[PDB]
Amino acid sequence: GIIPKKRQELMKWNGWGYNDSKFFLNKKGQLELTGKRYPLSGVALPTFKDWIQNTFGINLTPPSIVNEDFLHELKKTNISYSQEADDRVFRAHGHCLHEIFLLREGMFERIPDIVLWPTCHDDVVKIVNLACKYNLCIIPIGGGTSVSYGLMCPADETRTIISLDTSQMNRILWVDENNLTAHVEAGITGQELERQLKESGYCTGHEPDSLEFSTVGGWISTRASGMKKNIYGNIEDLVVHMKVVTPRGVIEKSCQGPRMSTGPDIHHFIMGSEGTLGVITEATIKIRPTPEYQKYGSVAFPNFEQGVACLREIAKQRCAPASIRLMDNQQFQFGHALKPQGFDPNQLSVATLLFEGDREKVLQHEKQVYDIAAKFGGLAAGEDNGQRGYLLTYVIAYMRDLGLEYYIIGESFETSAPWDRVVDLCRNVKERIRRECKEKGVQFPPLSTCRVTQTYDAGACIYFYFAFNYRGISDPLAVFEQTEAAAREEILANGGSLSHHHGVGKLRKQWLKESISDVGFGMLKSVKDYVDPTNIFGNRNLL
Amino acid sequence: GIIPKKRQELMKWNGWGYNDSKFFLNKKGQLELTGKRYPLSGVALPTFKDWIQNTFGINLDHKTDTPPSIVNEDFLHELKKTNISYSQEADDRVFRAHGHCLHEIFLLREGMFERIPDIVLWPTCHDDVVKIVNLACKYNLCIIPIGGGTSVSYGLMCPADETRTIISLDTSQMNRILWVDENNLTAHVEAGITGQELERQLKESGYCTGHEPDSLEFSTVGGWISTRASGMKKNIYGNIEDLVVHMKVVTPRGVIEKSCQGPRMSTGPDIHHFIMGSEGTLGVITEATIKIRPTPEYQKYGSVAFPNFEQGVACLREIAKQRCAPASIRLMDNQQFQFGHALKPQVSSIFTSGFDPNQLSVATLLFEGDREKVLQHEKQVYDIAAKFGGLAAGEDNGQRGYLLTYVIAYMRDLGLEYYIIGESFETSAPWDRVVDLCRNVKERIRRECKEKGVQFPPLSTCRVTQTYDAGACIYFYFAFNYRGISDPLAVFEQTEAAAREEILANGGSLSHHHGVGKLRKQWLKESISDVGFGMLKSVKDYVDPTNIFGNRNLL
Numbered sequence A: 001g002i003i004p005k006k007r008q009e010l011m012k013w014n015g016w017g018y019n020d021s022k023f024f025l026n027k028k029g030q031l032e033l034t035g036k037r038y039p040l041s042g043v044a045l046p047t048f049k050d051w052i053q054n055t056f057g058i059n060l061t062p063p064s065i066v067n068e069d070f071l072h073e074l075k076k077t078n079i080s081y082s083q084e085a086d087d088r089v090f091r092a093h094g095h096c097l098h099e100i101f102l103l104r105e106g107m108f109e110r111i112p113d114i115v116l117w118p119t120c121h122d123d124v125v126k127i128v129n130l131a132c133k134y135n136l137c138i139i140p141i142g143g144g145t146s147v148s149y150g151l152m153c154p155a156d157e158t159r160t161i162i163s164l165d166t167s168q169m170n171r172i173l174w175v176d177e178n179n180l181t182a183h184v185e186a187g188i189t190g191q192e193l194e195r196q197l198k199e200s201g202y203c204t205g206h207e208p209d210s211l212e213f214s215t216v217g218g219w220i221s222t223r224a225s226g227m228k229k230n231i232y233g234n235i236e237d238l239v240v241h242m243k244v245v246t247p248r249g250v251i252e253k254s255c256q257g258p259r260m261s262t263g264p265d266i267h268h269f270i271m272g273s274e275g276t277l278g279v280i281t282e283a284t285i286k287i288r289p290t291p292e293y294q295k296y297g298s299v300a301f302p303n304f305e306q307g308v309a310c311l312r313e314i315a316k317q318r319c320a321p322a323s324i325r326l327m328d329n330q331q332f333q334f335g336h337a338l339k340p341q342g343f344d345p346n347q348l349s350v351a352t353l354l355f356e357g358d359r360e361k362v363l364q365h366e367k368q369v370y371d372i373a374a375k376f377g378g379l380a381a382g383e384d385n386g387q388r389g390y391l392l393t394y395v396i397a398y399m400r401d402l403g404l405e406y407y408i409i410g411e412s413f414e415t416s417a418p419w420d421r422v423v424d425l426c427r428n429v430k431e432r433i434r435r436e437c438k439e440k441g442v443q444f445p446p447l448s449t450c451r452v453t454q455t456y457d458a459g460a461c462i463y464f465y466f467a468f469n470y471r472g473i474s475d476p477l478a479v480f481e482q483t484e485a486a487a488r489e490e491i492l493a494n495g496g497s498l499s500h501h502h503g504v505g506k507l508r509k510q511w512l513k514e515s516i517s518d519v520g521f522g523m524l525k526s527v528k529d530y531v532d533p534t535n536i537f538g539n540r541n542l543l
Numbered sequence B: 001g002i003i004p005k006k007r008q009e010l011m012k013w014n015g016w017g018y019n020d021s022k023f024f025l026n027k028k029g030q031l032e033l034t035g036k037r038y039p040l041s042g043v044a045l046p047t048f049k050d051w052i053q054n055t056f057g058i059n060l061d062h063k064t065d066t067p068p069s070i071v072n073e074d075f076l077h078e079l080k081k082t083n084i085s086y087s088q089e090a091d092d093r094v095f096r097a098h099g100h101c102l103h104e105i106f107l108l109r110e111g112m113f114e115r116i117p118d119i120v121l122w123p124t125c126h127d128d129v130v131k132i133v134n135l136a137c138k139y140n141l142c143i144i145p146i147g148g149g150t151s152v153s154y155g156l157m158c159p160a161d162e163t164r165t166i167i168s169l170d171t172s173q174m175n176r177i178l179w180v181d182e183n184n185l186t187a188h189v190e191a192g193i194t195g196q197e198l199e200r201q202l203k204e205s206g207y208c209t210g211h212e213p214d215s216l217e218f219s220t221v222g223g224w225i226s227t228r229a230s231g232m233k234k235n236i237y238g239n240i241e242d243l244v245v246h247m248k249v250v251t252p253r254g255v256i257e258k259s260c261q262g263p264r265m266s267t268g269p270d271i272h273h274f275i276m277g278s279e280g281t282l283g284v285i286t287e288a289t290i291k292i293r294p295t296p297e298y299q300k301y302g303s304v305a306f307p308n309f310e311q312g313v314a315c316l317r318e319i320a321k322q323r324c325a326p327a328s329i330r331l332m333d334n335q336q337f338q339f340g341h342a343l344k345p346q347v348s349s350i351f352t353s354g355f356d357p358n359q360l361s362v363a364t365l366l367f368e369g370d371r372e373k374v375l376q377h378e379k380q381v382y383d384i385a386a387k388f389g390g391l392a393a394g395e396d397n398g399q400r401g402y403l404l405t406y407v408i409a410y411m412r413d414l415g416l417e418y419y420i421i422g423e424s425f426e427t428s429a430p431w432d433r434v435v436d437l438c439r440n441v442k443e444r445i446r447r448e449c450k451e452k453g454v455q456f457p458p459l460s461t462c463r464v465t466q467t468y469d470a471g472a473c474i475y476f477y478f479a480f481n482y483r484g485i486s487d488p489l490a491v492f493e494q495t496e497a498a499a500r501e502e503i504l505a506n507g508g509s510l511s512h513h514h515g516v517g518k519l520r521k522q523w524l525k526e527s528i529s530d531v532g533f534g535m536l537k538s539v540k541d542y543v544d545p546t547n548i549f550g551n552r553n554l555l
């Protein structure tokens, strides 16, 4: 689960995930994931082609500019580095639709000049000192899974850009079994973190969909949320200590107390800072005994609003399972179409459930959730509709690359909102997307779908997928990017936030001042200007 | 539950709480609380005197102007036009010149403060606040906001060499519930509403916050946010940082507010955390939205005795490991067990003084929620406790323990009448440090007091008041008989600062909830790092570049 230095030997240079995993038609004419990595790898999907054809109407480098004296001092440190075109281009992007285009079909305007692979905190201190001495710009990179343009190099940045790659700084340093805390280097991936903890009988439970590649430091930088936050917390509840290298010096608290009142919480000044302040090198995270048992479930509702009302009541009774997601009809069908073999079926909606903990407790909780559900017309729909909509989740981004081969472009986007705004926001956003697409000359009605993906006391996270068959469309990116920007306007007009988890990066910068207020924005600026006065950390995210 | 403008008409000018509530000796010579407000009010406490005689070595027979208001005439003229209520009276200013640290109360009892507010203003809304901070910019004034006046960190004290006119900006008349949103289970409130009045008014609608810090009769929303307050039932309701969904803050730079009411976002560093724990140094928190819950169906008290404190700590740790802490669980050492016992009804004889009765520790429990869930959870928790030698010690004992928390602060004022000085202090620490930290802190206090010439061994006692996944909050009480000692305040303050050294050397935090104020400033940089100190400074310099908010807490 360690990312090798030459990423492209294992990962796709032009898309998501591993080289050995891509959808193909098997010898029975049916979509199938290549390779052996996933529970769905090698599993025929006999209705997936039918669903895709129905849904979309288809048949089926810049030179390296680097100071010689800097390079001389770098050689003395014995830190590994590269000026090769493939290494630099690989770290010049995340996973936004726009970037993945430039990467398949052209070239970016600016890419890092040099890649460095520090293996520890001290190496990071060396590199930030060199950047001060030689006037260099640093863009940190972990998993490279940003969906906010947070890795894109500014077109007019004229300094040498270092891509400071954290993927070789990836060890668990200590596991404290008395306090259930693990102290880890920040380049460790979710997958490798969980694998090594599980050999001791522990987990963190933090499971964002990008966990095979995304890193501890990246989660802290972007305020990451994982599928099971209902039991384990999101990144801000999980982290108890961190250590950060900035050009001003090293930020670290002197104790590992679980909660303190010692002024404004400086951990919150670093969480969500998106690579703009320094490098998070190590963090202490809460750990838990691995649960004894897991069960998936699902519930059908006669429509979406009944489902949303049921999720709301579950959150009011504070008895959410490990994960509870509510899919609208299109998303459900997407799922139903993906099996390996009453209620009006047009508005019929489906919640998927995941329970984990002790066997006897799990089965007791499962009963309670189905009883709350019955009050809203909800009927149990089975583990496999459950089991499968969550085996599904690590594969959806492999589907996006398949669409591009067939002239389909799609992206997801998200928001959080008060409970009382969820139904209208979902309906109005989906309709805004349909309206814009028609107005922009999109021939076929787009895929425009939502799910409720997390529940909170005060409201929910809502996740949208938007995609269309771009047949007969001149400029399919510009249509798509205008339509995304429009949906965000619609989100914010309906009381939703700028982002629940993806973050702001450079994609949503233009709305930030309005979201956090002028003085709010002025405060983020003031911390930046103190900690990094010469803007070494210049990816220009946020501000 | 609204604090009136002239506080001294209802509240003690020289101590904690209500004028109508104090301890006095009965017509039979038994200690008794006056008045009618608490469960213990008008209840004679026949053994309390002995306990005080035994713990402090005293008898209990042996008992024990203002600066001018400096204010610019033009300012005052513009203030008159706003119709904002104000006062230059010495008793209104003196009342707002202090919180509830021992030193301050001692100073109110035996003399005068070096610096007190020049004028007290009572805004009734966010717009009045905006007007007042505009005036302070225009006329170069200093503002110290005050809500309940319950700070225990010197957070209200006026800096002696502050030469500008100081406004005490009192929030107590800004106390409305602006809306209660039953769909989202949130209430948006003005920041001067007290805990007690907020809970009273929500309960009429079927709701509560569940945030119950021991000072809730007088401490306010704005205060809790400023100081990162923690309340008794955080295990169910959350501490202040989990409870706050939105806030509006007036600073000299302008108003800070997010544009939405979403429950969790990722829009950069969370600016609510720049404000929480700012202790009055950045601006005035005027309004805040807070989570609310239906009032619980049922509450159930309980208690459990363990063979010693260590076993009790190991049992709390297992309950935290199983994530099944009740709404409140507190473990008291043997000295607090003995104390609580000395508060009962029974009049003992004057001729009489499997568990060891003086090693035994006791935990008090409270569960609240739906009756069915409560009772299964109680059974779960008692099953765990038995594994550690725990024996159920009765619900009456748990209920009495809970009530007692609101009356302890009146006990402090009683000790002052009899030459006894005391204070509580607190920390948070990892699980693996708790037992050693408790033991070493208590022994440091005994050692310091002996070395400084205190005659009798001091009261030095502790309890575990909150469990977390990664550690616990530990609360200490320290008191001695200072009869015989020259400089009582210097001895106390020196022993207190020594204890804090011991806490920090044993892996405890600088504060779990009371905060930093001006009392703990000298450890702050070491606690949060030099760069983290610097980052706090940069926000303060941006938002308040002329230091209008000048109480000089933190930094």
Ligand SMILES: Cc1cc2nc3c(=O)[nH]c(=O)nc-3n(C[C@H](O)[C@H](O)[C@H](O)COP(=O)(O)OP(=O)(O)OC[C@H]3O[C@@H](n4cnc5c(N)ncnc54)[C@H](O)[C@@H]3O)c2cc1C
Pocket (backbone or CB within 6 Å): A094, A095, A139, A140, A141, A142, A143, A144, A145, A146, A147, A150, A151, A166, A186, A187, A207, A208, A209, A210, A213, A214, A215, A216, A217, A218, A219, A220, A221, A222, A223, A224, A225, A226, A227, A274, A275, A276, A278, A279, A280, A281, A397, A501, A502, A503, A539, A541
């Ligand atoms: C298919 C897919 C599924 C996803 N699902 C989820 C999900 O469930 N939940 C969720 O929250 N997110 C999700 N994301 C978004 C992304 O995975 C998260 O934002 C994640 O935290 C990024 O981590 P990274 O290590 O990949 O960071 P990168 O992409 O490498 O960097 C993100 C930003 O952090 C900065 N940065 C990186 N590491 C450091 C460091 N050590 N110190 C300082 N700055 C740093 C970078 O400069 C950049 O600004 C998903 C993305 C994709 C493409």
Ligand SMILES: Cc1cc2nc3c(=O)[nH]c(=O)nc-3n(C[C@H](O)[C@H](O)[C@H](O)COP(=O)(O)OP(=O)(O)OC[C@H]3O[C@@H](n4cnc5c(N)ncnc54)[C@H](O)[C@@H]3O)c2cc1C
Pocket (backbone or CB within 6 Å): B099, B100, B144, B145, B146, B147, B148, B149, B150, B151, B152, B155, B156, B171, B191, B192, B212, B213, B214, B215, B218, B219, B220, B221, B222, B223, B224, B225, B226, B227, B228, B229, B230, B231, B232, B279, B280, B281, B283, B284, B285, B286, B409, B513, B514, B551, B553
């Ligand atoms: C007997 C006793 C018991 C206590 N128990 C607890 C407890 O269980 N938990 C706990 O956390 N604390 C407790 N405390 C501490 C104290 O009550 C809390 O810190 C409380 O949060 C302060 O509230 P207040 O309204 O009294 O604020 P004040 O003391 O009036 O103000 C505290 C600080 O906040 C600033 N301030 C006040 N209002 C605002 C505003 N609207 N905007 C900006 N700044 C403001 C002040 O300038 C001061 O610096 C206790 C104190 C006492 C004496």
